[PDB]
Amino acid sequence: AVNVYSTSVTSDNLSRHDMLAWINESLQLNLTKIEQLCSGAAYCQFMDMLFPGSIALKKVKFQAKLEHEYIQNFKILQAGFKRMGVDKIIPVDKLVKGKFQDNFEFVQWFKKFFDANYDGKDYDPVAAR
Amino acid sequence: SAVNVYSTSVTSDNLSRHDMLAWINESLQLNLTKIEQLCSGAAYCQFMDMLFPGSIALKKVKFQAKLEHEYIQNFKILQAGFKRMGVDKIIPVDKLVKGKFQDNFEFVQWFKKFFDANYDGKDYDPVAARQ
Numbered sequence: 001a002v003n004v005y006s007t008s009v010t011s012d013n014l015s016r017h018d019m020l021a022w023i024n025e026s027l028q029l030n031l032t033k034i035e036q037l038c039s040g041a042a043y044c045q046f047m048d049m050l051f052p053g054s055i056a057l058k059k060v061k062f063q064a065k066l067e068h069e070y071i072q073n074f075k076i077l078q079a080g081f082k083r084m085g086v087d088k089i090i091p092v093d094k095l096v097k098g099k100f101q102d103n104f105e106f107v108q109w110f111k112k113f114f115d116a117n118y119d120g121k122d123y124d125p126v127a128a129r
Numbered sequence: 130s131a132v133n134v135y136s137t138s139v140t141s142d143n144l145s146r147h148d149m150l151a152w153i154n155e156s157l158q159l160n161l162t163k164i165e166q167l168c169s170g171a172a173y174c175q176f177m178d179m180l181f182p183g184s185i186a187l188k189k190v191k192f193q194a195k196l197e198h199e200y201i202q203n204f205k206i207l208q209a210g211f212k213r214m215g216v217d218k219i220i221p222v223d224k225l226v227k228g229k230f231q232d233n234f235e236f237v238q239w240f241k242k243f244f245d246a247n248y249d250g251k252d253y254d255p256v257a258a259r260q
Contacts, residue, residue, distance in 0.1 A: 015163060017230035 001084040010112040027125040038098040040073030047080040054080040070096040131214040140242040157255040168228040170203030177210040184210040200226040
């Protein structure tokens, strides 16, 4: 993977509205709040899109409702990060609590990471699920 | 009294977000970068002062508002202006002050149409007004 740091030159940050548009349009989802990224499932799917085979897709819990399930999804994501040489520590313990500030900070970074690595490949996120 | 604007009124075309910010910024001499920043209610209050001088308690508007409760105070000033001028529009204050884009964009589209139906072309110095 191409790593993204606080010192990297990136595009402007997105509003919460435009960030949710990116997630929902790219993955054919229906999130209404950034806090919902606490489940880790969308991140797992974006890793599948970026680097097919990096993520254990069959193990991701796409309808997770409980914190321990969120943690399972994030452990899948961490394993994908390790596989791809991603030098970002994921603050899993914080994210899964569903607080806006922590989740918004991480998604801003993740979108920059995504944009640095996406090759434009076609992807059917419904078919993938 | 104000000319009211409804979904059935014939109006100008809607503006893009960038064109809407340019209107607010140029007219009030502000530097907003996002539609969501209209959550503070201050720009709407000043527009009412421009449209109908004396309609708004201008001295009570919080132009440097940073916290939600101050946003609500500005919107209550606006609601009082609307009542004074016979404006029939319900302001969705709770939705606006949270900075939600869709709600703020929908409201400002209406507000610009309302403004254009009512503006008489008077001179207005928005900086001098805020001082």
